[PDB]
Amino acid sequence: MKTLSPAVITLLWRQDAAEFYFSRLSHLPWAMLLHSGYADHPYSRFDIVVAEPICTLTTFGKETVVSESEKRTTTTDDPLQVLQQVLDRADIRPTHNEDLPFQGGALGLFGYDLGRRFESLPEIAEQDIVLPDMAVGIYDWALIVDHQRHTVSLLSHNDVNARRAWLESQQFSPQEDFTLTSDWQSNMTREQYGEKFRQVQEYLHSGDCYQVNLAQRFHATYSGDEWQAFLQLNQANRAPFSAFLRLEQGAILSLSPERFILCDNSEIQTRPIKDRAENLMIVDLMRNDIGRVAVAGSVKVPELFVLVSTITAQLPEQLHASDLLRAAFPGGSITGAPKVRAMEIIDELEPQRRNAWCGSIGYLSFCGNMDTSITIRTLTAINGQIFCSAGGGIVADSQEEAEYQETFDKVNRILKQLEK
Numbered sequence: 001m002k003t004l005s006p007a008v009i010t011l012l013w014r015q016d017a018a019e020f021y022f023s024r025l026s027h028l029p030w031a032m033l034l035h036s037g038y039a040d041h042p043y044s045r046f047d048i049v050v051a052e053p054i055c056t057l058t059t060f061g062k063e064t065v066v067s068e069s070e071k072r073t074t075t076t077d078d079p080l081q082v083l084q085q086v087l088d089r090a091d092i093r094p095t096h097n098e099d100l101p102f103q104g105g106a107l108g109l110f111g112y113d114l115g116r117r118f119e120s121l122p123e124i125a126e127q128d129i130v131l132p133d134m135a136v137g138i139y140d141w142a143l144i145v146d147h148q149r150h151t152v153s154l155l156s157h158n159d160v161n162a163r164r165a166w167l168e169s170q171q172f173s174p175q176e177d178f179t180l181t182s183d184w185q186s187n188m189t190r191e192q193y194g195e196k197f198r199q200v201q202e203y204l205h206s207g208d209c210y211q212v213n214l215a216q217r218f219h220a221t222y223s224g225d226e227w228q229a230f231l232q233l234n235q236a237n238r239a240p241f242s243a244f245l246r247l248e249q250g251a252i253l254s255l256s257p258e259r260f261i262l263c264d265n266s267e268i269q270t271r272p273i274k275d276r277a278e279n280l281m282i283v284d285l286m287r288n289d290i291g292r293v294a295v296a297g298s299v300k301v302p303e304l305f306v307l308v309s310t311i312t313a314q315l316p317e318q319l320h321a322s323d324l325l326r327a328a329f330p331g332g333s334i335t336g337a338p339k340v341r342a343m344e345i346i347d348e349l350e351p352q353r354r355n356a357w358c359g360s361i362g363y364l365s366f367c368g369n370m371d372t373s374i375t376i377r378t379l380t381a382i383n384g385q386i387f388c389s390a391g392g393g394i395v396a397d398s399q400e401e402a403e404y405q406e407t408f409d410k411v412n413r414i415l416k417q418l419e420k
């Protein structure tokens with residue numbers, strides 16, 4: 001077991017380093033950027049850039065294709081377990097390093113439809129987006145941008161000098177300006193929306209769920225360099241869990257502000273914090289998922305009123321982060337409660353499958369840690385089609401019109417930014 005820490009070179013500091021080094025990689029497949037949106041907090045301290053994976057994992061439904069150089073392997077095993085074996089087999093296990101949250105390992109997309117490999121449910125919505133349910137690369141190196149130290153760190157478990165020379169020889173190519181070429185069109189009318197909304201309230205009325213996240217999807221055509229859309233969105237939104245993923249099948253543009261699950265040195269955290277008969281029950285939609293994997297008695301939640309995170313806990317020594325991800329996937333807070341029941345209703349009412357939206361983007365570092373986002377406020381750019389979805393958690397007392405409108409308000413800024 002190679003526990004050596006990775007070799008590191010520091011690069012000069014610049015307040016735009018991550019876009020500066022990733023600009024010239026954004027058209028390479030498996031080039032990926034996690035950007036903290038220039039946001040000012042502890043959980044928006046780093047930018048991470050990776051490219052040129054030594055190994056990739058592509059899951060499409062039941063199959064996962066593991067590809068490494070000339071070798072290519074297909075398997076129907078649990079894709080997270082398959083991920084875990086690939087990681088394990090690298091035999092690279094350096095000590096945690098708070099200045100290097102990711103020290104090579106896996107990084108990529110966990111799309112929402114990947115939860116069907118862990119949760120059984122009908123499939124009624126249509127698959128009109130062909131983009132993997134898991135698109136993840138194994139990287140033996142990374143570029144780390146640290147906003148608290150003002151440092152730029154290039155690291156590698158292989159020859160960090162040769163990785164540097166490679167990265168500094170990439171040339172800045174010119175890029176076709178980005179442009180929307182059509183108006184945004186919802187996959188549902190107000191009225192259709194109103195119907196699905198009423199259908200979710202029938203279920204709630206019947207006691208079949210307590211909450212369902214129902215979303216609609218906006219679609220437009222575009223031309224030009226998706227990196228360019230991303231620079232402009234990132235600017236405007238400054239979301240701490242943003243990401244730009246260049247996949248073989250399209251580009252994922254995430255302006256997510258929300259963490260999914262942090263696992264740092266076995267400590268788990270979810271979202272950063274920001275005689276009587278009690279009639280109210282307050283449920284954290286991720287509590288049961290975390291509690292199924294956390295160390296018994298380790299879960300802590302803050303005192304609520306009607307810890308730096310809503311849920312804090314401990315990972316058992318015998319589990320991996322990948323196990324933790326499995327158990328929580330897809331996120332309780334963007335599906336509803338009971339989760340799987342809610343997933344089923346969601347799939348009944350949403351004309352199309354969510355694919356990347358509301359899945360998770362993140363990394364499983366070789367040191368064991370993990371950080372992941374929930375991909376809300378995330379666009380999918382493919383074939384000159386770009387998509388952006390928006391949902392709202394419906395509960396018993398929600399109101400139809402207000403909820404419709406809430407869906408627009410969640411993303412109107414992103415859409416209108418791409419207009420004008």
Ligand SMILES: N[C@@H](Cc1c[nH]c2ccccc12)C(=O)O
Pocket residue numbers: 034035036042043044045046047048101240241242243361362363371372373
């Ligand atoms: N914001 C995280 C890094 C990050 C940016 N975008 C992400 C997307 C997914 C996971 C992590 C990230 C941090 O400071 O550590």
